[PDB]
Write a protein that binds this ligand. Structure first.
Ligand code: ZN
Ligand code: ZN
Lengths: 425, 7
């Protein structure tokens, strides 16, 4: 009972986590500190390392170099366990019918990928591999966790930081969407996500606007890193899968009071010095371990703590079960006018496409002789109201850029209102 | 260069 896995070093052995290794810059191969006679304490002094085979022709190694309280305050506060609200469901039982029954109102934790339909690389997939497929020269968004600021840099420059010792900075890559890279073919969203996604179901293949590039996020979180409380852009529901390590989620239900507190907190310039979990009633501590998948519903205010080096894949999506919440979080995001780095591209365009489908569903309901579900009719009313606000004569200029081609909002709005009026009877 | 620590 065997399989084939990558190996390294001259010894041609698989990666052993208890042995110090150094990557030769010439052949890009990792060598054990024992195999090539380089002790771990010697590693910081080495600027360029060449293995002995490469040293013969590529030259000798250039062995000439020449906050904490926020984490402590997070671990200090006592939080209810996520077992109270976060449900555990096997992947095979996490179906579209299950979503309709439970309404997707609380987070779901799937301990085993089996049945989810999720496609991820094997645990023998390392950050060095991420650099090769995404691209060493690709500019990525790196978050200075201590300073809570974002800075763009080369991916090879960050992965150089990742594969170093005595990391004087706490840097994270949580905004790396690789759907346009070679690594896009390695990760596919869970089948439940694709069924629920508005873009997956209702976005035309001939659409001139690019689809929201929010499907295949990759996360590389260093040890003792911290991600502050936030709402995914556009109230988008999210799925997080931990390939290696683990990550702790602090989830707050998007109650009316909690959402108002978040907006007031997030808008404050000193929001990086205010622990938001101390303002809410209940904040749940969810530990998502290696190989586990966490589904986060629309609008939930969540923060992540990373105790060990963790590699995770995430994705955002929009579904018909939380149309009201998705709009409300978008309204909060629109009023905040925060940075558009974590934004949801063409969120309104997806709504316009959804509204077009609802009109066709209303027409089909007349032909099929069946009433549309009440949550769709209510969601149509919510979307129709948003359509009027977006295409109001005073505010059409802002939302016109996200209007799909060959679209008559006045015709679409009037038809939706009439069909909704009919369906209410 | 790039290194991998122990555990
Ligand atoms: Zn070795
Ligand atoms: Zn070499």
């Amino acid at each position: 009972n065997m399989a084939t896995v990558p190996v390294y070093c001259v010894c041609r052995l698989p990666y052993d986590v208890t042995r110090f290794m150094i990557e030769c810059d010439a052949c890009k191969d990792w060598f054990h500190g024992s195999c090539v006679g380089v002790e771990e304490e010697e590693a910081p002094d080495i600027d360029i390392y060449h293995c002995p085979n490469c040293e013969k022709t590529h030259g000798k190694s250039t062995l000439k170099k020449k906050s904490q309280l926020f984490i402590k305050e997070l671990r200090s506060r006592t939080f209810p366990s996520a077992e109270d609200v976060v449900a555990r469901v096997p992947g095979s039982q996490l179906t579209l019918g299950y979503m309709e029954e439970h309404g997707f109102t609380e987070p779901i934790l799937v301990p085993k990928k089996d049945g989810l339909g999720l496609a991820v690389p094997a645990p023998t997939f390392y950050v060095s591999d991420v650099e090769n497929y995404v691209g060493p020269e690709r500019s990525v968004d790196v978050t200075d966790v201590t300073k809570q600021k974002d800075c763009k840099m080369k991916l090879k420059e960050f992965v150089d930081y990742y594969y170093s010792t005595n990391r004087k900075r706490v840097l994270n890559v949580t905004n790396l969407e690789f759907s346009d890279t070679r690594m896009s073919s390695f990760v596919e969203p869970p089948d439940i996500v694709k069924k629920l996604s508005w873009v997956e179901n209702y976005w035309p293949d001939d659409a001139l606007l690019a689809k929201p590039k929010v499907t295949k996020y990759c996360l590389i979180c260093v040890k003792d890193s911290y991600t502050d409380f936030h709402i995914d852009s556009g109230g988008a529901s999210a799925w997080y899968h931990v390939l290696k390590g683990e990550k702790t989620f602090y989830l707050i239900r998007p109650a009316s009071a909690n959402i108002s507190l978040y907006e007031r907190w997030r808008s404050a310039s000193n929001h990086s010095e205010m622990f938001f979990a101390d303002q809410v009633d209940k904040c749940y501590k969810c530990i998502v371990k290696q190989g586990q998948t966490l589904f986060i519903p629309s609008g939930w205010i969540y923060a992540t703590l990373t105790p060990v080096d963790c590699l995770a894949f995430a994705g955002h999506f929009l579904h018909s079960l939380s149309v009201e919440m998705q709009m409300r979080a978008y309204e909060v995001e629109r009023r905040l006018k925060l940075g558009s780095l974590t934004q949801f591209p063409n969120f309104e365009t997806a709504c316009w496409y959804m509204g077009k489908h609802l009109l066709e569903a209303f027409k089909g309901s007349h032909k099929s002789g069946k009433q549309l579900p009440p949550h769709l009719v209510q969601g149509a009313k919510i979307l129709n109201g948003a359509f009027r606000s977006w295409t109001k004569k005073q505010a059409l200029a802002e939302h016109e850029d996200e209007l799909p081609e060959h679209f008559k909002p006045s015709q679409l709005i009037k038809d939706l209102a009439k069909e909704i009026r009919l369906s209410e009877n | 260069a790039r290194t991998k620590q122990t555990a």
